[PDB]
Design a protein around this ligand. Structure first.
Ligand code: HPA
Ligand code: HPA
Ligand code: HPA
Lengths: 263, 263, 263
């Protein structure tokens, strides 16, 4: 039950079931990014997350997602379809366990994807934005002892350059992670603008900190699924977030495959 | 024990005990606002909150307040005398249950009142200020699943206009909700000024988010009970907060009755 | 088990074991400040914190620190060697219990020391900085009822003047307390700069609020152990923090002894 022990055990199961000793990249799919899977490549192995140690919070029954093993270029990639966010009420160890288990299975790069509100003038709905840095505004950490991790270049600049070779149209921005699940007030958005954020969302920051803690590099990719509250007046809804996710799914899947191949 | 089930059950008790099928407005009284009750109108039914499902946190014995049924104009109003704030240590479901139960009893408008420190130059002690928007600075939410609520116009502009017809002297401002129960340092107040806040307090933000989630409109009213730490130098105390509440009680009760009548 | 009852009981043990009815000053040593003890003075009594009521969180076995009784000038000083921070996962009552117990043993002044990242241009590694005020950015409080404490001059200006008589080179600054244990991103540091912070760390804010709540004056002293993330590019590590602590230990111990003597 130490998160690191269940991570090791998950990796044993992954290697055993896939035949693959080392998956060197992993992908965590954001809200609304699920339809991008087909466009990533064809999975050779599909593992229910429930059949893997440490993925499911002990209580609250509910059909977790899948973990896919997908060849992308010269990489074997672990793709996380379905995830748990802090707003679900479970210990952060479940929010970040996929990262830790992927790391234990050999992932040296974590591609952490999300749905985000755009805060910056230039941003359009459907636009992918690389994460240059983050503001963790949750007052929490997935780390528990005296485990001090340096977050300078938490979002690898070189993976960034790598990504922009694949799509020179890729802007980058600072992502603010909030608890959710309520969206923000217009006043809260003006505040985030003041604090230096370009993107806003309810995930990612803990996955990033756990990745860094475990020694992996991180590429962060936001899909702008809406403009942030108050910027245009358009109402925010999860259905609208899923809808933007699904409209951009072939683009996102294709982008991720090209970038990952380039690693 | 689902908060929505205890809300429904509370509403059954309310309708049964008051004879009133639908209370279409509710009022949550702020710290120090208790003496305003007399001035709201005469209650036809008084219900100990302890006799209502879901109001009292299982543990920590202590004499909760009352829920009053009060005719105000063409409305039957549920008035909450006594409440629980997050600084008490209980699950947020108890902080917001009065809102949810009022909603289940038919309230389509929640008048959420509070005591606040004034951050903006123009503000005087004893002055009521409408809440135009809020900064939730608690890192928490009363919502728990994937329950995504849009907080654009969380504080109904039209209820605002409505209120100002009753008292054209009503300024409005952005309210920052903090955890408490310690008051703020002068440095924290300068920070809140930078973040765009006009008012500061230890309640309200969760009641507002739960209201919106449940489909009610919100009118937020702050009594400025003191200037925020560092602005004038005057020391902050709860006795001083209660004292300002009590000095302004007839004014506040009268204001609320007039505004509510106008709904 | 009320924190105040275990505080009283700890003070009974302290007075019994030291022979000293009243220790009028206490010192809480920061990360990396442990080697400063020798330079404070020679302890007359050394008490394992485990032998004192309320210091150790019920679970998670681990060798706590010591509480030392040290004559410094005309004062008997309680010196805390080893402490618990919020990032350890324990209830805040354990983070602040040393303050409360010291107060119950007669401490009217708490010298709260820490390791901090420097955010302001002028700051050098190894430099002690007095805390003029704080930003509590944890979304938490060590206070639990309706216990409202005014934090105006939480860091006694007069103790400040007192300290600067001992070392006229002492700059002062606003300290931001964050949860940790991950260090900050460069974007988070630019945000803290915007919010008015000069120093950043993972302790102190709760000890200060508990001190004030209990009626003690506070002197806050940060050792700048590194420049904050992104300011110079230098990587942050706990080993580097301990190393700066140890290099500055004789200076810090000597400074504290001189200042405390002057009280
Ligand atoms: O605007 C947003 N805010 C918070 N989370 C989100 N997830 C998608 N869009 C948003
Ligand atoms: O100044 C304040 N700060 C926080 N809460 C308050 N409640 C009344 N006044 C205040
Ligand atoms: O830079 C810092 N940030 C947070 N905590 C710290 N403790 C020492 N230095 C630091």
């Amino acid at each position: 039950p130490d998160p690191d022990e269940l991570a090791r055990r998950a990796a044993q199961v992954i290697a055993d079931r896939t035949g693959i000793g080392e998956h060197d990249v992993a992908v965590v799919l954001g809200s609304g990014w699920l339809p991008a899977v087909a466009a990533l490549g064809s999975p050779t192995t599909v593992l229910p997350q429930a059949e893997l140690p440490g993925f499911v919070p002990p209580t609250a029954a509910g059909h977790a997602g899948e973990l896919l093993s997908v060849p992308i270029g010269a990489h074997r990639v672990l793709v996380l379809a379905g995830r748990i966010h802090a707003y679900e009420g479970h210990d952060l160890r479940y929010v970040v366990h996929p990262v830790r288990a992927a790391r234990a299975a050999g992932a040296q790069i974590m591609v952490l994807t999300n749905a985000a509100g755009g805060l910056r003038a230039d941003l359009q709905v459907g636009q992918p934005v690389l994460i240059s840095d983050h503001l963790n505004l949750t007052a929490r950490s997935p780390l528990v002892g005296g485990e001090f991790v340096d977050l300078t270049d938490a979002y690898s600049p070189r993976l960034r350059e790598l990504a922009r070779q694949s799509d020179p149209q890729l802007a980058e921005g600072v992502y603010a992670g909030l608890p959710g699940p309520h969206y923000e007030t217009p006043a809260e958005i003006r505040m985030l603008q003041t604090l230096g954020a370009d993107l806003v969302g309810m995930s990612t920051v803990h996955e990033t900190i756990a990745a860094r803690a475990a020694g992996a590099e991180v590429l962060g990719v936001s899909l702008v699924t809406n403009l942030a509250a108050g910027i245009t007046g358009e109402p925010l809804s999860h259905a609208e977030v899923l809808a933007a996710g699904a409209a951009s799914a072939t683009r996102m899947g294709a982008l991720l495959a090209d970038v990952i191949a380039r690693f």
